[PDB]
Amino acid sequence: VQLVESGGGLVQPGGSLRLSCAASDFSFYDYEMSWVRQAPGKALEWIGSMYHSGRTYINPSLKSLVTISRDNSKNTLYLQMNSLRAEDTAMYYCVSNWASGSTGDYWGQGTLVTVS
Amino acid sequence: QCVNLTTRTQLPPAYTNSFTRGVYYPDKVFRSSVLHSTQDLFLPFFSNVTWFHAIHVSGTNGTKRFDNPVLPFNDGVYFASTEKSNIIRGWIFGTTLDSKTQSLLIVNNATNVVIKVCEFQFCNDPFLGVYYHKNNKSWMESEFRVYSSANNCTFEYVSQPFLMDLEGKQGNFKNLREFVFKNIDGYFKIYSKHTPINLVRDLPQGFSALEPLVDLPIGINITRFQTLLALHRSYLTPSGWTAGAAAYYVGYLQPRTFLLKYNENGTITDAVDCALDPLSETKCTLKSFTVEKGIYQTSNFRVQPTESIVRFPNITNLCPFGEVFNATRFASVYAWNRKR
Amino acid sequence: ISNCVADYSVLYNSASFSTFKCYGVSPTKLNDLCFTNVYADSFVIRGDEVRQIAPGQTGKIADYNYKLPDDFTGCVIAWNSNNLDSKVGGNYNYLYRLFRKSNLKPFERDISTEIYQAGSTPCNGVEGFNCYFPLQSYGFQPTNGVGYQPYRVVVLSFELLHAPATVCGPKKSTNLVKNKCVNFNFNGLTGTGVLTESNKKFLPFQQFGRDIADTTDAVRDPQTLEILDITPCSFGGVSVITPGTNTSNQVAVLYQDVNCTEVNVFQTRAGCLIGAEHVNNSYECDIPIGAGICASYQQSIIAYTMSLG
Ligand SMILES: *[C@@H]1O[C@H](CO)[C@@H](O[C@@H]2O[C@H](CO)[C@@H](O)[C@H](O)[C@H]2NC(C)=O)[C@H](O)[C@H]1NC(C)=O
Ligand SMILES: *[C@@H]1O[C@H](CO)[C@@H](O)[C@H](O)[C@H]1NC(C)=O
Ligand SMILES: *[C@@H]1O[C@H](CO)[C@@H](O)[C@H](O)[C@H]1NC(C)=O
Ligand SMILES: *[C@@H]1O[C@H](CO)[C@@H](O)[C@H](O)[C@H]1NC(C)=O
Ligand SMILES: *[C@@H]1O[C@H](CO)[C@@H](O)[C@H](O)[C@H]1NC(C)=O
C-alpha cells in the first residue's frame, strides 16, 4: 500500500498514541485531508479536517482531545490522540484527497491496538 | 521516460508503385454481380508509394538510425509493412503534436488494442524501448515517453485486438497489414485486413479488397502522424537505448472515380481507375470490363487558361465618400438630394 | 457521458421522486433528442436554499459553490433522501461555508480557500476575528425535521455540442412478423413490403443488400443477425371486362398479375379473373385479355383459349 501507519499496541488505560503516514510530492496533498476510524460495533465517526492553509474544524461531539501537527516539505500530517481509553481496540486510517469524492480518495491499512 | 534519440540517416526512398492496392468497401451495402461506380477517396493505381525505410541496420558495423519523421498528411495514408518481428506498435495521430491540442493514439498491446485520445504533454523526442520491471515478470513498452501526462480528456476505446500475430506459420504471410485512416465530417474511419505475400520488397500484382474493422466516433481534424517501432535495451554485449529495425510504407489518397466489380458472394474481385488510361475510361463509360471493337465518345478535353488579366482605367487617388455620409445636414424626406 | 445511451425513461422509474422542475428543456422528449455530453450533479443541500439556483436569485450556495448553466440544458432535479444520513446525536460532519469574495461568473468551480477580510482589520495569514473559517457542521438526526434532513438532488445537465452521436435514448424495439405487408424501420431503412427469410452470403460487415438501380431487397436483423428479403406485396391495375350496356350488366374484374390467393375465380398469366366461368370451348376472340386467353358473352361471361382457326 502507498500509505502506511506506525503506532499502537497494548497500552494501559490513559496512555498516548500516534500514527505516521507520509507522502513525497508537494502537490499530492491538494487539497483536503482528514482522519477516520472504524471500531467494531461502531458506525463512522469523523473527527476533523483541514485545508492546505491549515484551518481546522472538528466534530463537536468528541472535540475535546484533538491535536494535530502538519508538515509540507516532509509532506506529512499527524493525528495525535491521547488518554487511551478501553474503547480503542480497532484499526485507524489516514486519507489523502479525502473530499475529492467517491473515486478521489485513497485508503490505508492501520495497525492493531490492544486496550484494557 | 521522456528520453530522446533521433540520429542522422536520411537515405532517400526508392520510389515504388503499387499495382492494384487501395481498393476498399466504402459502404456496408451487399452487392452481387453488379459493377458499381463510386466517386470516393481512393489511392490511384500505379502511383508513387513512398518506399520508406525504418531504422537502418545496414550490416557491416551497427549504426542504427531513425527514419520516422512528421509528414504532411492531406486525406489518408495507405500503410503496409512486413514486420516479421512484431515491431510496429502504434500511431501518433495529431494536429500539432504538442500540448493545447487533442491527439489520437493507437496501441497494439497484443492482449487488448487501446485506442486512446487525450490532451497529452509530449516530451522532446518520442520513441519506444524495453526495460526491466524487477517484478511480475513483465517488460516496459510505455508510450508515456511519447505521452508524458494527460489532462482534461475522457476518450478511451479498448476492443478485441485486430493486429494479432496471426502469422502462426513462420513464413509466406509476413502480415502485410494494409490500412487507410481517413477523416470524414468529424468522424474517423479505419479499414484493414491481412494479406500473405512472399515478395522480398515492393508490392505484388495481386488484388485484395480491404475490409473495415473499426470506426471511431471522436472528430479530430488530424493532420500530422507518426509511427511506432518496437525497441529493446542494450545489454552488456560489446545509456543505451532503442535497438530495432523495421520497414514501413506511406501513401496518400486522392479524390478519384472508381468502378468496382462484385462477386456473387459480395466480395470485390476487380477494380478499374476511371482516370488513368483512355482504355480504362472506355470501360467506365460502358460499365463493362470487356469492350467490343469500335469507337466510343468518352469525354471532352479542353486546354485550360494559364494566367489572370485585370484591366481598369487610369483613375487613381480619388475617394468621394464622406461628403454624402458625413455631411452636416441631409435634405427632407420628400425632397431628397440626389448627388450623382 | 459519451458514446453511451442515457436511459432517461429508466431514470423516470429508478428511485424515489418528488419534484420535477424543468426550464428550457422539455421533460417528455429527453430520449428523442440525442445530446453530446452530460455532467451529472449530486447536491447535498437542505430544501430551504435549493430554490435559489436560477437567474435573478442569490444565495450562499447557488451562486458560490457549483453553478448550473444559465441556459438550463436540463432540469432542476431534486428528490428526497430522508432515510440516508440520519444518526442519533446530530450529524455534525458535513461542511458549511460562511462567505466568499464577491459575485462570480457562471461556471466557476472553486477549489482554493484564500482568507477573507470582513472589515478594516486585515488578516495577512491570521484566522479568527473578521477572518472566518470556511467550514461549519450540519445537523442530521432521525428525529430532525424532514426539510432539514438530507435530500438526494441529482441534477442532470445536457449539451448540444457539434460532436458525433455520443448521448441519446434507448428508443426500445418491437418484434418481427414475416410474410405480411408491414412497415419496417431498421436503423433508418424505412419502407413497406413483405419480409421473408433468405439465403444470401452476407459479409459480416455488410448490413443490407441492394440490387441494380438501388432497390434494397435484403437486410440483416440487428438482433438475430439473419438475412431477410424485402419485396413490396401485390399491386397492379384493375380492368373490367364488359359486354356493353346494351345486352346485360354483368362484368368480370381482372386484377393484373395479382395472384388469386390474395384479395368464380380463374387464374391466368395476365392475373386473376374474378367473375368468369372457364370453359374448354374455343371460338373467335371477342374481348382480348392476354396470354392466349380472352373472354366473351354467351348466358354469362366465359373465358376461352382463343381458337386460331
Ligand atoms: C479542423 O482542422 C484543423 C486541425 O488543426 C483545426 O483548424 C485549423 O487550425 C489551424 C491553426 O494553426 C489552421 O492552420 C488551420 O487552417 C485550421 N483548419 C481549417 C480547415 O481552417 C480545427 O480542428 C478544425 N478547423 C475548422 C475550420 O473546422
Ligand atoms: C515517381 O517519382 C519519380 C521521381 O521522383 C518519377 O520518375 C516517377 O515517374 C514517379 N512515378 C509515379 C507513378 O508517379
Ligand atoms: C440481443 O439480446 C437478446 C435478448 O434475448 C438475445 O437473445 C440476443 O442473442 C442478442 N443478440 C445477439 C447477436 O446475441
Ligand atoms: C401464385 O398462385 C399459384 C397457384 O398455382 C402458386 O403456385 C404460386 O405459388 C403463387 N405465388 C407466385 C409468386 O406465383
Ligand atoms: C375442361 O378442362 C379441364 C381439364 O383441364 C376440366 O375442368 C374438365 O375435365 C374439362 N371438361 C371437358 C368436357 O373437357
Author numbering:
A (entry chain D): 2 to 117
B (entry chain B): 14 to 251, 256 to 357
C (entry chain A): 358 to 620, 641 to 675, 690 to 700
Study text:
S protein exists as a homotrimer with each protomer consisting of an N-terminal S1 subunit and a C-terminal S2 subunit, cleaved by host proteases (such as furin) during viral formation. Demonstrated by cryo-EM structures, the RBD in the S1 subunit is highly dynamic and adopts ‘up’ (or ‘open’) and ‘down’ (or ‘close’) states, where ‘up’ corresponds to receptor-accessible and ‘down’ corresponds to a receptor-inaccessible state. The crystal structure of n3113 in complex with the receptor-binding domain (RBD) of SARS-CoV-2, combined with the cryo-EM structures of n3113 and spike ecto-domain, reveals that n3113 binds to the side surface of up-state RBD with no competition with ACE2.
To further estimate the binding pose of n3113 on the SARS-CoV-2 trimeric spike, we determined the cryo-EM structure between a prefusion-stabilized ectodomain of the spike and n3113. The global map of UUD and UDD were determined at a resolution of 3.55 Å and 3.7 Å, respectively, in which coordinates from the S trimer and crystal structure of RBD-n3113 were fit by rigid-body docking. Unexpectedly, n3113 binds exclusively to the up-state RBD in the dynamic spike albeit its paratope is theoretically accessible in both up and down states.
